[PDB]
């Protein structure tokens, strides 16, 4: 599983420990063991949301399964909550794209997961 | 809706106002209200297009609907035109990937 | 075809020829002429893989065709081999997402394919 956050919040506002927090909370919310979980945060980006350059984030969560209607609602509350508390980004200036990956289309260590 | 541009053009070649321009043009071209449009530009990238390091761009347009055959053609003309006039990138060195997102797979404001 | 690598390896550890090597190897592996292949490498990223900040990569390969079960297994070998030799990333710390793109959903040169 992979979680990516792109944000115009400066690097200095990302707390020490944020990646660890994300890895642990995602493991807890999805049930995936943390060992299979990757996390990627990209600060200081040039972006706009609704024409405004106030703090925002564009994110993506890729997973083989564990994606659907109810789950994604629950992840969006979790992740917007984390972005608001830790990076001070308003939840209405966050988008998160969810991707249910086919195991045949995910490579890892010289093979795929199919 | 979100539009992302990754390019090897340096930051100083991105005009002031380019993100506002993109937002307004995408609203006009797609009919989405501008308040739902997010834009993201990433300059100074390490990339190659066809083995060459001359100016290029790799882009993505994600939208809940408003994606399809004719529409994507029309967006590619708009967007390549913008990248050419504004960033001086040749249209034959631009790729744009279009994604029709399911509303159930887009989170926003604590929900989907 | 486009291939993107995001990694926490610093920019100075990415060999200057890496982008061209990727282009050429992908052309050979997929049969796409190299003039159609774009490559993008993003170093110095803030990332973790399994909670650990040791070298890792998150990658994507997008292509109109040339994507499927067997092909993707083959590309993962090719690309883990390259990342291991050139960026010294362990292959068990690489994810690659593969995307078979509809030609209608790829723009290029003012139109789509």
UniProtKB/Swiss-Prot annotation, chain C:
Give induction info.
Up-regulated in concanavalin-A-treated lymphocytes. Up-regulated in macrophages upon exposure to M.tuberculosis antigens.
Gene Ontology MF: a single term: phenylpyruvate tautomerase activity
Task: Classify the main location.
Answer: secreted
UniProt KW keywords: Acetylation, Cytokine, Cytoplasm, Immunity, Inflammatory response, Innate immunity, Isomerase, Secreted
Task: Give the CC-aspect GO terms.
Answer: cell surface; cytoplasm; cytosol; extracellular exosome; extracellular region; extracellular space; ficolin-1-rich granule lumen; nucleoplasm
Q: Which Gene3D superfamilies match?
A: Macrophage Migration Inhibitory Factor
Give the catalysed reaction(s), semicolon-separated: 3-phenylpyruvate = enol-phenylpyruvate; L-dopachrome = 5,6-dihydroxyindole-2-carboxylate
A Pfam family of the record is MIF
Which InterPro entries does the UniProt record give?
Macrophage_inhib_fac (IPR001398), Macrophage_inhib_fac_CS (IPR019829), Tautomerase/MIF_sf (IPR014347)
Subcellular location(s): the record lists:
Secreted; Cytoplasm
SUPFAM superfamilies xrefs: Tautomerase/MIF
Main enzyme class: isomerase
Q: Which residues carry this modification: N6-acetyllysine?
A: 77
Summarize where substrate binds, as residue positions. 32, 64, 97
Listed EC numbers: 5.3.2.1, 5.3.3.12
Role summary: Pro-inflammatory cytokine involved in the innate immune response to bacterial pathogens. The expression of MIF at sites of inflammation suggests a role as mediator in regulating the function of macrophages in host defense. Counteracts the anti-inflammatory activity of glucocorticoids. Has phenylpyruvate tautomerase and dopachrome tautomerase activity (in vitro), but the physiological substrate is not known. It is not clear whether the tautomerase activity has any physiological relevance, and whether it is important for cytokine activity.
Family per record: Belongs to the MIF family.
Record's miscellaneous remark: Serum levels of MIF are elevated in patients with severe sepsis or septic shock. High levels of MIF are correlated with low survival. Drugs that inhibit tautomerase activity protect against death due to sepsis.
Q: Which disease is it linked to?
A: Rheumatoid arthritis systemic juvenile: An inflammatory articular disorder with systemic onset beginning before the age of 16. It represents a subgroup of juvenile arthritis associated with severe extraarticular features and occasionally fatal complications. During active phases of the disorder, patients display a typical daily spiking fever, an evanescent macular rash, lymphadenopathy, hepatosplenomegaly, serositis, myalgia and arthritis.
The annotated subunit structure for this chain is: Homotrimer. Interacts with CXCR2 extracellular domain. Interacts with the CD74 extracellular domain, USO1, COPS5 and BNIPL.
Q: What protein does this entry describe?
A: Macrophage migration inhibitory factor
Source organism of this protein record: Homo sapiens (Human)
- Annotated gene: MIF
């Amino acid at each position: 599983m992979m979680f990516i956050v792109n944000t115009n919040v400066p690097r200095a506002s990302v707390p020490d420990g944020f990646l660890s927090e994300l890895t642990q909370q995602l493991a807890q919310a999805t049930g995936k063991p943390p060992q299979y979980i990757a996390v990627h945060v990209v600060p200081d980006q040039l972006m706009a949301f609704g024409g405004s350059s106030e703090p925002c984030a564009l994110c993506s969560l890729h997973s083989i399964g564990k994606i659907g209607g109810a789950q994604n609602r629950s992840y969006s509350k979790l992740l917007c909550g984390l972005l608001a508390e830790r990076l001070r980004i308003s939840p209405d200036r966050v988008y998160i794209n969810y991707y249910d990956m086919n195991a045949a289309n995910v490579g890892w260590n010289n093979s795929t997961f199919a």
